[PDB]
Amino acid sequence: CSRDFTPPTVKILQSSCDGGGHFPPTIQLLCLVSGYTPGTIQITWLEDGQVMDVDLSTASTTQEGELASTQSELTLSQKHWLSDRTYTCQVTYQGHTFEDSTKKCADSNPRGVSAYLSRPSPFDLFIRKSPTITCLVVDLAPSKGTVQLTWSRASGKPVNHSTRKEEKQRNGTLTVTSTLPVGTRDWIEGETYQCRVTHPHLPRALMRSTTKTSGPRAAPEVYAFATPEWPGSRDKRTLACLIQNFMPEDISVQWLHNEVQLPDARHSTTQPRKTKGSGFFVFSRLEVTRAEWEQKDEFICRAVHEAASPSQTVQRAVSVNPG
Amino acid sequence: DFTPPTVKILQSSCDGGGHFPPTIQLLCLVSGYTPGTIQITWLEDGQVMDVDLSTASTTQEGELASTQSELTLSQKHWLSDRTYTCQVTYQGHTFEDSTKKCADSNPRGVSAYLSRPSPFDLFIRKSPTITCLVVDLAPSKGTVQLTWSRASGKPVNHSTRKEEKQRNGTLTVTSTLPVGTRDWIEGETYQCRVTHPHLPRALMRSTTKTSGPRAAPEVYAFATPEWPGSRDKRTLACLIQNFMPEDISVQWLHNEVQLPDARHSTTQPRKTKGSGFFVFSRLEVTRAEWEQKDEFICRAVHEAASPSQTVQRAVSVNP
Numbered sequence: 001c002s003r004d005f006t007p008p009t010v011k012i013l014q015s016s017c018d019g020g021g022h023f024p025p026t027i028q029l030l031c032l033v034s035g036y037t038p039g040t041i042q043i044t045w046l047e048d049g050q051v052m053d054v055d056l057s058t059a060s061t062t063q064e065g066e067l068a069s070t071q072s073e074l075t076l077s078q079k080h081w082l083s084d085r086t087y088t089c090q091v092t093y094q095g096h097t098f099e100d101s102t103k104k105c106a107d108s109n110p111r112g113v114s115a116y117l118s119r120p121s122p123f124d125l126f127i128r129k130s131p132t133i134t135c136l137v138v139d140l141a142p143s144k145g146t147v148q149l150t151w152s153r154a155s156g157k158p159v160n161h162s163t164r165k166e167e168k169q170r171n172g173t174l175t176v177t178s179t180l181p182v183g184t185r186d187w188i189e190g191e192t193y194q195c196r197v198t199h200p201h202l203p204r205a206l207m208r209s210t211t212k213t214s215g216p217r218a219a220p221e222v223y224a225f226a227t228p229e230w231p232g233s234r235d236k237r238t239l240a241c242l243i244q245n246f247m248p249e250d251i252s253v254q255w256l257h258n259e260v261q262l263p264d265a266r267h268s269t270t271q272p273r274k275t276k277g278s279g280f281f282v283f284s285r286l287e288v289t290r291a292e293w294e295q296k297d298e299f300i301c302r303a304v305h306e307a308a309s310p311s312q313t314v315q316r317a318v319s320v321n322p323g
Numbered sequence: 324d325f326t327p328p329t330v331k332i333l334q335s336s337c338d339g340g341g342h343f344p345p346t347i348q349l350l351c352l353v354s355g356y357t358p359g360t361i362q363i364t365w366l367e368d369g370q371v372m373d374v375d376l377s378t379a380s381t382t383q384e385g386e387l388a389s390t391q392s393e394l395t396l397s398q399k400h401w402l403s404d405r406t407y408t409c410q411v412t413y414q415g416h417t418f419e420d421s422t423k424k425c426a427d428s429n430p431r432g433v434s435a436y437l438s439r440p441s442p443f444d445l446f447i448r449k450s451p452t453i454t455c456l457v458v459d460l461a462p463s464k465g466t467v468q469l470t471w472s473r474a475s476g477k478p479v480n481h482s483t484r485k486e487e488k489q490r491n492g493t494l495t496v497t498s499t500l501p502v503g504t505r506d507w508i509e510g511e512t513y514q515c516r517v518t519h520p521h522l523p524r525a526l527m528r529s530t531t532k533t534s535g536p537r538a539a540p541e542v543y544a545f546a547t548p549e550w551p552g553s554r555d556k557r558t559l560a561c562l563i564q565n566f567m568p569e570d571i572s573v574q575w576l577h578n579e580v581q582l583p584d585a586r587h588s589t590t591q592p593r594k595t596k597g598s599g600f601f602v603f604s605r606l607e608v609t610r611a612e613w614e615q616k617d618e619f620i621c622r623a624v625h626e627a628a629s630p631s632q633t634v635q636r637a638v639s640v641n642p
């Protein structure tokens with residue numbers, strides 16, 4: 001009887017702290033699905049949006065009377081809980097989905113504002129040829145002043161107009177992002193840019209500066225490799241790229257396939273680390289699919305770096321299929 | 324044959340923003356025990372709470388009973404740091420567990436981390452240790468007390484202790500504790516307790532073996548081709564992936580000898596796009612080495628590998 005149809009609701013409980021207020025070594029998240037009309041159900045856990053493998057959780061369904069109830073328990077290390085990740089319990093039931101999320105409760109006193117200033121990316125500098133720098137202001141407490149953000153150059157020369165975006169975050173904080181276009185010649189010849197930040201709730205101004213990294217230059221070497229085919233990887237293959245011996249550390253790494261620049265999200269790429277000698281190195285890992293290599297069996301690891309010649313780029317291709 | 328009751332308390336979680344709900348539920352679970360007389364009483368700071376504040380119920384499944392009691396608290400009361408005790412009396416014997424609001428994880432901007440043993444130290448060296456690290460504490464007066472304990476309450480050995488004033492003017496305290504190889508593998512919980520005169524209260528971290536699924540690493544090793552201008556050097560790269568849990572040790576061997584840790588680097592474990600973790604390890608080698616013997620071994624030590632927690636792959640510079 002339709003009038004008796006009962007939709008699931010979703011609630012997450014967590015392992016309690018002890019009598020001292022301390023976390024247990026492991027945290028259980030228990031996703032409870034309230035009594036609902038019987039019918040196929042599936043529970044999926046997400047970590048910061050990413051599907052977690054079902055291995056990490058267990059699910060149990062009970063029916064008592066005319067209502068079904070389901071719970072799923074996810075177990076996490078204290079370390080991971082304390083890293084402030086967000087976990088989502090996703091329930092799919094007869095069509096649409098229901099969900100709930102949780103993370104470590106926020107600390108008592110939200111701390112103060114901080115600001116970060118980034119250099120242009122090599123990609124923007126050399127490929128797009130529209131370099132910008134970004135001043136990011138975080139941990140703002142809303143409904144106060146406005147947070148003044150002013151750009152200037154060491155030379156005293158004029159700055160271009162910047163864009164400004166304010167975003168309310170889930171944890172209740174505010175971030176303010178200002179992006180400033182910089183002259184290409186200006187940047188490359190060593191101009192210094194300053195972001196100056198002020199707010200009523202701030203005692204003295206925050207001042208951040210950025211300029212091209214000085215010192216020795218060296219071009220990157222690029223090497224792309226495929227893991228072998230084996231029973232555990234018949235319709236997917238893992239590619240890897242090692243980029244090394246470059247200086248300074250500023251580099252942009254992308255994977256290209258079939259005239260498309262793949263989304264950054266597709267690969268896991270390390271931040272530059274010093275070699276055992278001179279220069280830096282980065283590793284990139286990219287999992288590809290059969291559909292991709294059957295479309296075009298060519299995957300290109302490309303590095304953009306000021307010291308690569310002729311055109312600030314070095315790349316290597318890898319194929320996974322004999323043809 | 325007889326299964327005694329155990330007690331555990333769960334509670335309403337904070338939302339995706341880390342915000343508290345309007346009310347807090349505490350749920351005391353006594354799961355899977357031999358049926359018998361049972362009572363669940365809640366205490367607030369040691370005093371029995373009114374009967375109308377909680378509702379207890381019991382069900383039977385096969386040879387076991389399961390009991391639970393739900394207590395609802397105002398956010399205000401939870402946030403006031405009162406302690407709540409679930410007091411279970413089963414066949415005239417009392418079992419208790421207690422909870423209060425989780426304390427700040429980063430008081431005064433301080434952070435504290437606690438590691439698990441390295442698989443190399445645990446399985447090869449047979450002398451596992453864990454390390455408690457505390458960062459960003461003020462160089463004010465008073466000493467930083469860093470004490471170790473086991474959840475079981477069994478003895479611990481002495482530990483190392485090192486404090487260093489950092490370039491940014493902050494202070495970090497490090498302590499390393501030797502643990503029982505068997506004690507650790509069997510699931511002991513180790514606790515690092517930090518007290519700073521400037522800190523409001525003791526800060527604790529706890530660690531124990533993974534309880535998740537296990538999966539052995541796949542190891543693949545590659546040699547860079549010669550790069551123009553670099554005739555007498557090559558780089559070896561080792562991709563180790565799809566292992567679980569994430570704890571892993573990597574070594575390289577050449578001419579049957581394990582190379583010094585300083586010869587190579589390994590990335591921090593990170594998730595693959597599906598199950599498990601991966602790391603990359605990198606080893607620069609010289610013509611003199613590969614001409615002496617052209618075989619280099621990338622070896623992973625991991626609890627899921629067998630027979631002896633080890634899986635490896637050799638690579639050569641030349642065909």
Ligand SMILES: *[C@@H]1O[C@H](CO)[C@@H](O[C@@H]2O[C@H](CO)[C@@H](O[C@@H]3O[C@H](CO[C@H]4O[C@H](CO)[C@@H](O)[C@H](O)[C@@H]4O)[C@@H](O)[C@H](O[C@H]4O[C@H](CO)[C@@H](O)[C@H](O)[C@@H]4O)[C@@H]3O)[C@H](O)[C@H]2NC(C)=O)[C@H](O)[C@H]1NC(C)=O
Nearest residue numbers: 082083434436437438454456458459489490491492493495
């Ligand atoms: C003032 O200057 C000091 C300089 O020392 C800074 O202190 C550093 O702060 C960082 C960040 O807090 C510390 O990094 C943390 O290290 C933990 C322990 O790892 C050590 O031990 C393991 C295991 O043996 C080694 O593998 C590792 O190399 C270290 O030796 C980690 O467990 C922490 O992990 C967390 O952060 C990482 C970031 O990569 C995340 O990926 C994890 O998910 C997790 O959240 C963390 O990495 C570091 O130890 C400190 N350096 C030193 C030398 O002590 C201060 O931060 C700085 N203060 C200010 C205000 O700038």
Ligand SMILES: *[C@@H]1O[C@H](CO)[C@@H](O[C@@H]2O[C@H](CO)[C@@H](O[C@@H]3O[C@H](CO[C@H]4O[C@H](CO)[C@@H](O)[C@H](O)[C@@H]4O)[C@@H](O)[C@H](O[C@H]4O[C@H](CO)[C@@H](O)[C@H](O)[C@@H]4O)[C@@H]3O)[C@H](O)[C@H]2NC(C)=O)[C@H](O)[C@H]1NC(C)=O
Nearest residue numbers: 110111114116117118134136138139169170171172173175
């Ligand atoms: C409430 O919620 C928000 C998130 O919604 C949190 O805001 C984050 O706060 C952290 C720390 O304050 C911010 O981390 C900083 O990010 C900078 C920018 O990152 C991007 O841009 C750079 C430059 O283009 C890229 O390199 C990078 O890949 C990102 O795309 C970094 O530049 C900063 O790095 C510095 O600190 C880190 C510490 O991790 C060091 O490792 C670095 O070496 C360097 O010193 C820094 O990481 C983060 O950007 C914020 N996220 C936002 C705004 O979206 C709040 O922290 C949270 N509040 C509470 C109470 O937790």
